[PDB]
Paper text:
[name] is important for ookinete survival in the protease-rich mosquito midgut, assists with penetration of the mosquito epithelium, and aids maturation of ookinetes into oocysts. We delineate the atomic structure of [name] as recognized by six mAbs covering two distinct regions defining functionally important epitopes.
We obtained the structures of four site 1a antibodies, 1190, 1262, 1269, and 1276, in complex with [name] to 2.4, 2.7, 2.5, and 2.2 Å resolution, respectively; and two site 2 antibodies, 1245 and 1260, in complex with [name] to 1.9 and 3.3 Å resolution, respectively. Site 1a mAbs 1190, 1262, 1269, and 1276 recognize the EGF-like domain 3 of [name] and compete for largely overlapping recognition sites. Of these residues, two in the HCDR2 (Thr/Asn53 and Asp/Ser54) and one each in the LCDR2 (Tyr/Phe52) and LCDR3 (His95B/Arg95) contact [name]. Accordingly, 1190 and 1276 demonstrated similar interacting buried surface areas (BSA, 1136.8 and 1104.0 Å2) and hydrogen (H)-bonding networks (17 and 14 H-bonds, respectively). In addition, their H- and L-chains contributed almost equally to [name] contacts and BSA. In mAb 1190, a S54D mutation in the HCDR2 leads to an additional H-bond, while both 1190 and 1276 each have an S52F/Y mutation that introduces van der Waals contacts with multiple EGF-like domain 2 residues, and ensures that Asn87 adopts a favorable conformation to H-bond with other LCDR2 residues.
Numbering used by the authors:
A (entry chain E): 1 to 9, 11 to 95, 95A, 95B, 95C, 96 to 210
B (entry chain D): 2 to 164, 169 to 172
C (entry chain F): 1 to 52, 52A, 53 to 82, 82A, 82B, 82C, 83 to 100, 100A, ...
Write the structure that this text describes.
Amino acid sequence: SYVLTQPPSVSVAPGQTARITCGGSNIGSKSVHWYQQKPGQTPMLVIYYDYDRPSGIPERFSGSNSGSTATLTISRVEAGDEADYYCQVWDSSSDHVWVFGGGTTLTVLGQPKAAPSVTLFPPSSEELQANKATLVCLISDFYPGAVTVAWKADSSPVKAGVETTTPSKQSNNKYAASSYLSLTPEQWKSHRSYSCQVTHEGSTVEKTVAPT
Amino acid sequence: KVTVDTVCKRGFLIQMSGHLECKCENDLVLVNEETCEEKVLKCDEKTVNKPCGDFSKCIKIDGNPVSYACKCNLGYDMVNNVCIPNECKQVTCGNGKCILDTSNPVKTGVCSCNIGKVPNVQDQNKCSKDGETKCSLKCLKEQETCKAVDGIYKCDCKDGFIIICTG
Amino acid sequence: QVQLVQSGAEVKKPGASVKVSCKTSGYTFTDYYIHWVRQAPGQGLEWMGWINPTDGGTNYAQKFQDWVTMTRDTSITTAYMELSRLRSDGTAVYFCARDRITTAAPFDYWGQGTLVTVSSASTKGPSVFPLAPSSKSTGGTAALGCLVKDYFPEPVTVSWNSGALTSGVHTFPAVLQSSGLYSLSSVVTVPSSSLGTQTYICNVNHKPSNTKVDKKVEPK
């Protein structure tokens, strides 16, 4: 199957130049189209036929395509350019399909980095009385708005029962997120402790609770 | 946009199923959509920015050593050794050629077909459908009408005349 | 002006079917393909297939060949996509888009998208549990909140102290759990010194089930 390969993340400061690569087998012989999708909005064409620009798209958007890599270049990046970007080609072969890249999230750093605050709530005794148990991990006041959460049960990782929200802006324009671990009341008392691990920009913050 | 009233300098109108364009006189190349000129056979220091093919010019490339190449003009790409619009880079038409559809803000490459063929909406608008195309060329020169030559409409001497057209 | 207008959000049970429409206007319907693109939450765009408005010809990605049927009505220039045997984990947004009928034309206009939520659940009010502050939930300030468990459908609204308390409050987006039920939490950062003197009551409102819950949150 024909594949388009994009990097998952690109981060730039306002005014800098961002480059988003789209790798493909002999992609230079194909017409590459680029689409911009802001969070919760409709995808929008920004570059088509390798380097043509629709009216309304600023000149600082430019595209190139050669060999095995097509590139979207955004000069003088602004906060409004923060969005996901997808490349797209038509596979002329017998498979006869349109192909989208994996998408690239462009982060535009509009404020200094901020490590998150982690607060881990144990299950309330009320919920235990209802024969359920939910651990609530509060992640607040971080920037940029991307984290990864891992749950540990007595020094061992936890797979099932985890739900995590996509980060969203707080009142102070910093990001917040939440992670829930669902247990049975027996599992809650069976282990000596449970831990919530939040990874943000390489450094991990950890919080632990125990039955009490 | 090329029309039936367009004068093709050093050239002449030709008609296909969906468009008109200028075709150059023998050994000439298009330097513009309405202008034909002589073409350089090899790009060198004395031929910079001079025509070397349809919609292509000679360019100098500073280097060690200095190199020269025939480069397509802006908006054109080299495809099967010919300069065609970049919107047509991936368009194969069969019994026709790809042209520019500019009826929308977003341009697209679409097919225009040899006489007798029309774009087949059931086959990616390729030239796989039989259909008639009436000639619209005004051939107002002496003893010449519209004739289908190698699948395209052009003005040509009437039956019994040869190149102005003489008997 | 070219417009692609899709039908509204849908809620369906696993194994059921749904038919989403894409009303088109402002251009010659028969000159452009209609494509459908699926997007699971937090995931990338995925091309599903196209329909040719002239003959109703369809071209599907292999992975959607078995449970997707694309049709069109030329008299009202509307395209349709029917999903069959919906999977319990198949909640996703579906976009329609057009491009010129030719090879490799870009998708110049898109519909606004249609959310299809798949859940076996029916209307159900939420359970509300307190997230009590304590010695471990205290820099020089403390966090407390309310856990709003297992409601259906969306939405719930949470206020604190009947709206009198706003600064520090953050209500999170809901999560759609494997059970097909939603859960969220609303949290508020407060001065630790005011604990035991200030009263914190979260007001949970679930209009679909006609349920209101007020939960006083006190220190452990």
